[PDB]
Design a protein around this motif. Sequence first.
Motif: not given
Lengths: 151, 151
Positions: A12, A16, A19-20, A83, A86-87
């Motif tokens: 992550g 991340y 991903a954003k 976040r 996500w993890d």
Amino acid sequence: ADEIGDAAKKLGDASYAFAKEVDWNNGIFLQAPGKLQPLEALKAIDKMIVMGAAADPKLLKAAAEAHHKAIGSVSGPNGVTSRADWDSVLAALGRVIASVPENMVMDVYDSVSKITDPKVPAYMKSLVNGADAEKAYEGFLAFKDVVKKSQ
Amino acid sequence: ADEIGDAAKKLGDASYAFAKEVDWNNGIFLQAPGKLQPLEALKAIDKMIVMGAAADPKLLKAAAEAHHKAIGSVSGPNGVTSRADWDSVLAALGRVIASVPENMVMDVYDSVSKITDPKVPAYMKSLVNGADAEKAYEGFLAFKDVVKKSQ
Ligand SMILES: CC/C=C\C/C=C\C/C=C\C/C=C\C/C=C\CCCC(=O)OC[C@H](CO[C@@H]1O[C@H](CO[C@H]2O[C@@H](CO)[C@H](O)[C@H](O)[C@H]2O)[C@H](O)[C@H](O)[C@H]1O)OC(=O)C/C=C/C/C=C\C/C=C\C/C=C\C/C=C\CC
Ligand SMILES: CC/C=C\C/C=C\C/C=C\C/C=C\C/C=C\CCCC(=O)OC[C@H](CO[C@@H]1O[C@H](CO[C@H]2O[C@@H](CO)[C@H](O)[C@H](O)[C@H]2O)[C@H](O)[C@H](O)[C@H]1O)OC(=O)C/C=C/C/C=C\C/C=C\C/C=C\C/C=C\CC
Ligand code: CLA
Ligand code: CLA
Ligand SMILES: CC(=O)O[C@H]1CC(C)(C)C(=C=C/C(C)=C/C=C/C=C/C=C(C)/C=C2C=C(/C=C/[C@@]34O[C@]3(C)C[C@@H](O)CC4(C)C)C(=O)O/2)[C@](C)(O)C1
Ligand SMILES: CC(=O)O[C@H]1CC(C)(C)C(=C=C/C(C)=C/C=C/C=C/C=C(C)/C=C2C=C(/C=C/[C@@]34O[C@]3(C)C[C@@H](O)CC4(C)C)C(=O)O/2)[C@](C)(O)C1
Ligand SMILES: CC(=O)O[C@H]1CC(C)(C)C(=C=C/C(C)=C/C=C/C=C/C=C(C)/C=C2C=C(/C=C/[C@@]34O[C@]3(C)C[C@@H](O)CC4(C)C)C(=O)O/2)[C@](C)(O)C1
Ligand SMILES: CC(=O)O[C@H]1CC(C)(C)C(=C=C/C(C)=C/C=C/C=C/C=C(C)/C=C2C=C(/C=C/[C@@]34O[C@]3(C)C[C@@H](O)CC4(C)C)C(=O)O/2)[C@](C)(O)C1
Ligand SMILES: CC(=O)O[C@H]1CC(C)(C)C(=C=C/C(C)=C/C=C/C=C/C=C(C)/C=C2C=C(/C=C/[C@@]34O[C@]3(C)C[C@@H](O)CC4(C)C)C(=O)O/2)[C@](C)(O)C1
Ligand SMILES: CC(=O)O[C@H]1CC(C)(C)C(=C=C/C(C)=C/C=C/C=C/C=C(C)/C=C2C=C(/C=C/[C@@]34O[C@]3(C)C[C@@H](O)CC4(C)C)C(=O)O/2)[C@](C)(O)C1
Ligand SMILES: CC(=O)O[C@H]1CC(C)(C)C(=C=C/C(C)=C/C=C/C=C/C=C(C)/C=C2C=C(/C=C/[C@@]34O[C@]3(C)C[C@@H](O)CC4(C)C)C(=O)O/2)[C@](C)(O)C1
Ligand SMILES: CC(=O)O[C@H]1CC(C)(C)C(=C=C/C(C)=C/C=C/C=C/C=C(C)/C=C2C=C(/C=C/[C@@]34O[C@]3(C)C[C@@H](O)CC4(C)C)C(=O)O/2)[C@](C)(O)C1
Ligand SMILES: [Cl-]
Ligand SMILES: [Cl-]
Ligand SMILES: [Cl-]
Ligand SMILES: [Cl-]
Ligand SMILES: [Cl-]
Ligand SMILES: [Cl-]
């Protein structure tokens, strides 16, 4: 707690930002990754079904539950989950991967590669920060090493 | 053996002629059933994920295994699985449906209906023998009564 969970935290940290940047509400993800090829795509889906049937049922359940929770925390203009979620998703999917033989995982990868046009990865990367995509991928390489040690 | 298995045999008698008429290799099934609506579609997928997480893990596994076997017996110009594998899939999915509360099943149905354009069912029916589609549906109505009695 386990090592895949610890590794998910590191993944992550690495991924991340990427991903954003993905626009998760883009309709392109419903399209075939290239030309529509139903017969070859069915072979890829068959490899996925074999893998799903072999996966630990508790870990599949936990992975579904992590995605339900992730949907709940979606925010911002690109549809990105929190976040922490996500993890969570990363770790739960790593556990699922670790629960089946490496060959089943490779068979999915090879079978999807066969239907994915060579332009698709570069087109996806072009929509995000390239350095953030590369860090995410470098993260993924570290993470899969932890997954393999549990497999 | 169970009652859903017996009911699946009857549903196959009612629906296999229709299944043979569907062109399973048509690329249209990858498209949204109407206009692409990512936010509403995510709500439908969320209802599906909730249902999958609640479903009996053994019955999900068995349903995946029935689809792998069905892929193996595909033949003919439309990609249709064998009659026996059709019935197998029907029964395994009925068991999965019966393993969760009726509300979870209805929530998926309502959430998918919300993204399905009213023209889609009639367009699908127009590609097959209409009387065979109606028999299949009449079959489905009898089958779900057996599923509900197990739920
Ligand atoms: C009705 C039906 C309904 C729905 C349809 C169903 C399914 C949708 C079907 C298909 C759409 C899905 C996906 C296709 C969509 C999008 C594609 C998403 C995948 C992608 O973009 O991949 C990019 C990757 C790039 O290539 C790598 O480059 C490396 C470079 O690395 C160096 O240099 C640095 C780099 O910065 C690093 O720091 C490093 O240190 C350094 O080493 C190395 O050379 C590697 O050897 C090389 O592998 O390409 C491949 O892996 C090729 C196969 C792709 C297979 C495709 C996919 C992955 C496989 C499996 C994922 C499993 C499943 C995916 C599917 C679903 C998920 C469950
Ligand atoms: C990247 C993302 C990847 C992939 C994308 C992901 C998903 C794809 C997403 C969406 C595409 C999927 C599906 C949409 C595709 C295709 C659509 C497939 C569905 C369809 O065609 O349905 C037709 C049905 C017709 O209406 C019925 O008419 C009846 C008439 O009956 C009378 O008269 C006689 C008739 O001959 C009979 O004999 C009888 O005796 C007599 O009673 C009654 O009036 C009923 O009250 C009335 O309900 O329409 C509805 O049910 C409306 C909701 C649809 C919801 C849609 C779907 C079903 C719901 C849930 C199924 C669950 C899931 C579907 C999805 C997946 C399966 C797992
Ligand atoms: C809720 C909606 C939802 C959505 C939108 C997605 C979306 C996705 N899923 Mg998930 N999934 C879901 C629910 C969902 N899933 C559920 C309910 C389950 C069951 C529990 C799964 C189980 C599942 C599995 C088992 C896998 C996926 C994977 C994927 C990706 C497939 C395409 C791809 O590889 O892109 C690229 C992938 C990403 C953008 C995700 C991040 C990947 C790493 C960590 C960082 C990025 C690295 C690099 C830049 C790009 C990928 C390279 C690749 C070779 C690794 C895509 C991001 C696959 C995946 O990610 O394969 C790589 C995969 O293996 N899903
Ligand atoms: C291997 C590839 C594969 C393919 C191509 C499909 C394709 C499909 N799946 Mg399946 N599925 C698969 C694997 C696959 N699945 C796997 C691995 C699993 C996990 C074990 C599932 C679990 C699953 C579930 C839980 C459900 C589906 C359903 C469906 C259908 C969704 C669209 C729809 O409703 O059409 C219309 C449906 C059909 C043409 C199938 C026959 C339906 C009846 C018995 C006869 C026809 C009646 C009428 C004319 C049309 C439908 C009306 C409706 C209101 C019932 C579609 C036919 C759904 C479905 O059928 O909902 C109704 C559904 O509930 N799938
Ligand atoms: C019913 C149910 O259970 O459904 C659930 C089932 C699951 C498995 C749990 C689930 C899941 C995960 C899934 C399916 C993930 C799928 C990911 C797909 C990613 C697809 C991508 C990237 C597609 C493309 C297409 C592209 C095309 C690009 C090009 O054409 C373009 C523009 C221009 C050309 O000139 C060149 C080109 C560059 C070639 C591209 O660049 O990328 C989910 C979502 O939960 C639903
Ligand atoms: C019972 C039931 O219903 O189960 C259901 C359960 C689900 C989950 C919903 C379901 C599903 C979906 C499934 C299984 C998806 C599986 C996804 C697998 C993903 C695999 C991946 C990404 C594999 C790889 C392999 C890679 C290798 C990369 C390298 O080797 C390369 C090239 C070069 C080397 O130098 C270094 C290297 C880097 C090592 C890679 O980079 O990635 C299904 C089908 O619906 C059934
Ligand atoms: C429309 C909308 O808003 O959608 C929203 C929906 C959500 C869900 C809320 C959402 C989200 C989160 C999402 C999608 C997260 C996706 C995460 C994917 C994770 C995938 C993983 C870990 C896959 C793998 C595959 C692996 C394979 C490893 C091996 O094969 C390798 C390499 C080499 C072999 O030698 C050894 C091996 C070990 C076999 C692994 O180790 O891991 C978001 C972003 O908000 C969008
Ligand atoms: C019926 C209906 O409507 O269903 C709806 C249901 C949903 C769920 C709502 C829905 C949805 C959302 C979905 C599936 C989202 C899937 C998202 C997948 C995103 C994938 C991305 C970003 C892929 C990449 C790949 C890249 C590769 C980069 C690199 O390889 C490159 C080039 C070269 C090197 O440098 C190494 C590298 C760095 C590795 C990258 O950088 O990114 C949808 C579509 O709306 C349909
Ligand atoms: C990664 C992984 O695990 O993936 C696995 C995940 C699962 C869930 C296990 C899985 C599964 C099952 C799935 C997704 C089933 C999906 C079924 C979708 C059916 C879609 C249909 C009917 C779409 C349409 C679109 C149509 C459009 C029609 C029109 O636009 C047209 C022409 C003309 C307009 O003027 C009018 C119009 C009439 C409006 C239509 O008429 O119908 C599978 C396959 O195994 C893959
Ligand atoms: C752990 C894990 O990974 O799990 C994964 C497992 C899966 C399976 C792969 C997965 C998935 C997909 C899932 C759950 C799909 C769920 C499908 C549900 C289908 C529901 C249906 C058709 C419901 C109905 C209801 C109907 C009602 C009709 C009537 O009321 C009506 C109008 C009018 C009345 O007068 C008479 C009536 C006739 C009564 C109908 O006609 O149909 C997922 C999400 O990937 C997660
Ligand atoms: C490209 C290619 O070749 O693909 C090939 C892939 C395969 C897999 C090999 C293949 C195949 C076979 C396929 C797709 C079969 C699909 C079967 C779907 C079955 C779905 C079922 C049973 C769904 C339901 C939903 C139900 C809901 C019931 C209730 O809600 C109802 C109503 C009313 C509530 O009050 C009570 C209730 C009880 C809650 C139920 O009772 O059942 C084929 C054809 O060869 C194509
Ligand atoms: C990345 C990639 O390439 O993935 C590939 C992966 C795959 C698996 C290979 C793949 C695939 C195949 C798939 C999902 C196939 C899905 C098939 C769904 C078929 C649905 C059909 C027939 C629906 C209907 C609905 C009808 C309704 C009829 C009636 O309501 C009507 C009007 C009025 C009344 O009379 C009552 C009634 C009688 C009830 C009907 O009659 O039929 C694909 C697409 O190639 C993509
Ligand atoms: Cl810890
Ligand atoms: Cl440690
Ligand atoms: Cl091309
Ligand atoms: Cl019997
Ligand atoms: Cl009886
Ligand atoms: Cl419209």
